[PDB]
Design a protein around this ligand. Structure first.
Ligand SMILES: O=C1Cc2cc(Nc3ncnc(Cl)c3Cl)ccc2N1
Ligand SMILES: O=C1Cc2cc(Nc3ncnc(Cl)c3Cl)ccc2N1
Ligand SMILES: [Cl-]
Ligand SMILES: [Cl-]
Lengths: 4, 124, 124, 4
């Protein structure tokens, strides 16, 4: 999971 | 927004759509390319091809279970492009590049047409 | 093999599937969550959810145009997860995390369940 | 395009  | 994003999600979805295609699950169309038949999902074809997008948004063609392609279309070129649609991987070779590029032009798959043009230019 | 790969292909396919969902094109099921209704593509739901994969591979349920979820399922939690299926982006917030995690457990979306567990653990 |  990432900060887009 | 303040959303979080799962990096591998799109790839995982495409992998599962290909698994459903291999097991012939919820395929709703057969693409006829001369003597050859290819089963697929109309939504994936539309998502990958400008030609299929136009065909399946048409009020009469959206309901057809069989689509016949132009007789000049090579079945192997189509097979390679169908595999690309469901996997992101293109099996481009010296022996098939001309058929793949002509099929991609017909199907309106601009990124495939682009790489075929570049690979041909390099060989000239 | 000796294939070449188009990096953005899976993301581009998912983006187009979401555009077809927004315009209600070739959607073949309505998911009923208490008073709320959500139109979707059966193939995308199966590709994202262990629960939908089981439902639509069932010889009788594969043909249903309406699926009713358990009354304990929160419509907002479902809406957030449906948006995630079609975009890879999860709108996870303090006010919805409990409903999102419970819905993801029911739908069998293990990566969502995992990030909800981690976000909850950090707040404890 | 890349070599996967
Ligand atoms: O080279 C390409 C690949 C391609 C795909 C599609 N597909 C869609 N485009 C916009 N909205 C929707 Cl809903 C879809 Cl399905 C249309 C044109 C082209 N051209
Ligand atoms: O957490 C998850 C996400 C998920 C998706 C699916 N989907 C599929 N799996 C295998 N082959 C096929 Cl053909 C599909 Cl469609 C099944 C289980 C789970 N669990
Ligand atoms: Cl393309
Ligand atoms: Cl997930």
């Amino acid at each position: 999971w990432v900060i887009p | 927004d303040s959303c979080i994003q799962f990096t591998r999600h799109a790839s995982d979805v495409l992998l599962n759509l290909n698994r459903l295609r291999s097991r012939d699950i919820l395929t709703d169309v057969v693409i006829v390319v001369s003597r050859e038949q290819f089963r697929a999902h109309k939504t994936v074809l539309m998502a990958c091809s400008g030609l299929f997008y136009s065909i399946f948004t048409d009020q009469l063609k959206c309901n057809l279970s069989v689509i016949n392609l132009d007789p000049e279309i090579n079945p192997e070129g189509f097979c390679i492009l169908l595999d690309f649609m469901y996997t992101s991987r293109l099996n481009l070779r010296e022996g098939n590049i001309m058929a793949v590029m002509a099929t991609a032009m017909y199907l309106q798959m601009e990124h495939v047409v682009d790489t075929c043009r570049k690979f041909i230019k390099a060989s000239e």
